[PDB]
Design a protein around this nucleic acid. Sequence first.
DNA 1: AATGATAGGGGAGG
DNA 2: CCTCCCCTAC
Lengths: 511, 28, 97, 351
Amino acid sequence: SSVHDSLTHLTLEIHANTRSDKIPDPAIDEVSMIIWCLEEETFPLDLDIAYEGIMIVHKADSTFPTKIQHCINEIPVMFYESEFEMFEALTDLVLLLDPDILSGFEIHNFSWGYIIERCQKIHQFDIVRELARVKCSDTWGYAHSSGIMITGRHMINIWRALRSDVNLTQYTIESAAFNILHKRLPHFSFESLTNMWNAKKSTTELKTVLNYWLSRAQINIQLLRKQDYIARNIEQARLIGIDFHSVYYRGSQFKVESFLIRICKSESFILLSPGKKDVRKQKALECVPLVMEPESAFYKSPLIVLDFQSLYPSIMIGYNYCYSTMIGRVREINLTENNLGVSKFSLPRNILALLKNDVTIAPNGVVYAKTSVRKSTLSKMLTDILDVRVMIKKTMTTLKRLLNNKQLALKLLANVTYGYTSASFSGRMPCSDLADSIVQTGRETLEKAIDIIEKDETWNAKVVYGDTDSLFVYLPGKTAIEAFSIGHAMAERVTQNNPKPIFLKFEKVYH
Amino acid sequence: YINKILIPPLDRLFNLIGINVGNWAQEI
Amino acid sequence: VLDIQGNQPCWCVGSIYCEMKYKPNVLDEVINDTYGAPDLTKSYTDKESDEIMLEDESGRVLLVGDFIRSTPFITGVVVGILGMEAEAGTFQVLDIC
Amino acid sequence: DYFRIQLNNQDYYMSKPTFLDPSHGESLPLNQFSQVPNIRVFGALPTGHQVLCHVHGILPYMFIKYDGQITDTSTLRHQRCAQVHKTLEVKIRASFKKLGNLNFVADVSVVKGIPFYGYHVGWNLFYKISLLNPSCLSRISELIRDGKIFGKKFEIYESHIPYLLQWTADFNLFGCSWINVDRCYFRSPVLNSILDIDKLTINDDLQLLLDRFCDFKCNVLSRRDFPRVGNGLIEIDILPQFIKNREKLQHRDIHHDFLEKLGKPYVSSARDMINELTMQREYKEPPETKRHVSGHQWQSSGEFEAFYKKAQHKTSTIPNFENFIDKQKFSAINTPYEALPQLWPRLPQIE
DNA sequence: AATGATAGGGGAGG
DNA sequence: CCTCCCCTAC
Ligand SMILES: Nc1ccn([C@H]2C[C@H](O)[C@@H](COP(=O)(O)OP(=O)(O)OP(=O)(O)O)O2)c(=O)n1
Ligand SMILES: [Ca+2]
């Protein structure tokens, strides 16, 4: 077909016989079944592999493989005398397909982790060094990600990905399948599975366990596909520019650093790298967001909800707030030594007099250069990402999915951008003054909006609740049909009293 | 279960109106 | 069942395996009175069939032919199939006991 | 017409300097390098064939403040770079437990730049300390910042950015994107015969690509010097000159003076996205006429204005836009994006 | 080994 | 009143 612009995906599952409800331990209980599923939609080269397979240990009596073959009759099954040969065959299969991602459900104490532990502890075989694409500890890795590190290939823990994606009580294969794929799967205890697997007769039981594990393996691909996790992560990586591993393993500051270094490298900018001690000894944050306690009561009349769109990004775009735009705190401006966050510097001789007009003092008290002398870099980044997001949203099946993935990635990047500042702890390039300015001017904008809304006599409305950018205005007995017009009018009035990127949206009402 | 799972949240929601849910539960 | 392999007639005794899916009306009736019954039609559509096997505690073989078609069968019923293997693990049917 | 490899995964390792790697530097050319870093790229061809790529000549670097004066005659800069290189090498060798076979620092060079943490308008001189082992770069930065190396503490620039991120950003690379390269070097037999993959994976398109890019006469490296290390299909070795993803970057130097005050997206990924959307299909968005305040007056604006007037009266000694910054040509000093082409070894041929 | 800020509320236990 | 823990809003 067309060119290959996706990542190959392979999933694996393990069945191990337990011993009277002991949750099979990877040191006493051996592997028996390595049912694996390979994603077909994104796999090129059209090779005869059938995209599916089952591996079963059989010492070899003379009827078990034949019975299994007839009861399956669809997927080829390979039988091995020992689990070491079965592991070697699995390694050969991985080296043949050479998948980009090896995944599974709860891969720490199960299939991938179980195989790794069995190979390392019992057989003294380093399966990790053999499954890599190169011939020749991670507490954070196991905390909220996959702790397995195989060279070349990415390990994806499906349950963690779904936990980060969808919020629901409990996280099991059955619950996820029912709440995502609308499939109900019977669940059998380990003792029962061992009993069916140890029954020489009753082909029905063998077919039952085989279909059990086959469905468990197959449903993983559908779960990752319906949420479109792989494609969304690939699109986000292409947008930000970080590798596929850093999309989910690294933190939010990594993406912001990537954008910043990519933008600044074209403008001959040199980024400062403060130490941990410098960040620890910097001035603490003083400005806090404005939240008002609502009047706890039941509101019969319609309640219009107003919410600013990207309040902080719009603030930084409009007010030109950046690292390269701070001149200094308006109080205590010395020509010898100053203080701005984690750095000290000295102003030139006649800098203030030269730019006495093209500056804008922040609410916190920090002088910022106007756009007429220097356009800030963060404003450039935020306006570019916002323009791209609104363009793709305005344009908006495959193209629709790609546009949705791009929209989500752009929203995530824009939201994480502000978090780069105000990083008092575990911050690699923080700036207390910039974050304080942003929060304070957000508070001022909120107060101005509230005053404008309350001032109008024709709108006998009063603000009852307030958040970082949320306004709850109450219209006592105001026939909600016309409440939409009033809400649109106040949104337009508030918008027309702010710089260009600042915008207010009505978007809903509570009768 | 009744008291310590339903009385607190229903009381938080309905004390704004001005009614005590616990009185309703007392009669049963 | 695994001993019937060759170009010679042979007979064996085993139970009959069939599909026997439920009728949709029964499924609707049991779903409407369970309060949480899943989409049981998915259990029949996922598999997506028309064949008869012979299970005798050692495996199954497909009962192809015409004598086996013109007889209603229910799963779990044992019979005395007497036929000949022709070209695969499929067993022909000539007489039934 | 370009060899295209997707950025699926990346890693780095230390190897001995071959004829495809830099062996010396400009500060201390006499002393060679004990080891050099190499970046491994795990990618797949557009036809679907996995390719392993080794990247040579890419070195991590960090910037520290230049101590000398801007009135150098292009000769004292080299001497100062040599002295600081020797001091760094000695101090790291002593702390980490005749000076030859450099193991930590490759070379030190002087590059211009504009600081980012604050408002700066003029060119500032910086050192470019290129290291050999990127893993210990954080340790070197900590030692320099803590005053263990020199007699005074020095601020560190561009040390929180990892080596892989620097390499990707310098050459205009994005994750899961094509690495458009025109020339490559092949290794031990291209169609690997691990078990049988030299027959199943091969197709017409793969053979056409090999015929277009592989010559088997002056392209395949020697078997003895460069054995395969990848358990996959065809493996290539690349040089920094070969990567043509760069040269599409728009370099601007408008921040060295008040160019803006006198008479297209800034992210190339966004440019690619909008190009794709235009190819898929005009686009417009009518704005709203906003009449803001005269100066957006706030509660504590008067005190701020008074303090600004006091500060302006304090630091003053009539400045003009065209005559504020001093007009030091700084033509000899290399631009940061004009400095990474340095240290690229050669265009060798050892066939 | 890696981690972006701040603000509110409830519940158990001592 | 105190700390500890859960976890949702922005
Ligand atoms: N995880 C978060 C969520 C929000 N905010 C801050 C940034 C916003 O400027 C402000 C408002 O948050 P919103 O939830 O309203 O999101 P936005 O206003 O930024 O965009 P949108 O309105 O489209 O949701 O709160 C933050 O710092 N971190
Ligand atoms: Ca909002």
